[PDB]
UniProtKB/Swiss-Prot annotation:
Origin species: Bos taurus
Binding site for heme: H36, H60
Whole-protein coverage range: 9 to 89 of 134
Function comment: Cytochrome b5 is a membrane-bound hemoprotein functioning as an electron carrier for several membrane-bound oxygenases.
Protein known as: Cytochrome b5
Similarity field: Belongs to the cytochrome b5 family.
Length: 81
């Protein structure tokens, strides 16, 4: 496992680097921003933070969750969970 602090994840909130936390897992979605069927805006608003509630609320297919696995870079540090 690779752990990332909330302090570190929060720096990745822009077009050069966008990270997202979903259910304690950290994803680098920089290359996915323009490819997202739900638009760049919803991802840009949540960039550098936890979006678990937002992701589950709209509903996402198993296909969306399998695609999500390809962007995983680590997990949120246990002290920030
Ligand atoms: C901030 C987090 C996210 C929000 C709020 C969000 C929101 C949405 C919305 C509104 C749609 C439109 C379909 C609908 O009306 O239900 C959608 C579709 C989709 N999203 Fe996201 N999404 C998020 C993150 C992601 C991520 C991280 C991925 C994958 C890497 C992803 C992949 C998709 C795909 C593939 C679809 C097409 C419909 C489906 O397969 O379920 N989304 N998203
Ligand atoms: Cu989960």
């Amino acid at each position: 496992v690779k752990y990332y602090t909330l302090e570190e994840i929060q720096k990745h909130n822009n077009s050069k680097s966008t990270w997202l936390i979903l259910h304690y897992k950290v994803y680098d979605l920089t290359k996915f921003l323009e490819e997202h069927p739900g638009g760049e805006e919803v991802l840009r608003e949540q960039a550098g933070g936890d979006a678990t509630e937002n992701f589950e609320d709209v509903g996402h297919s198993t296909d969306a969750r399998e695609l999500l696995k390809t962007f995983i870079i680590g997990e949120l540090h246990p002290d920030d969970r």
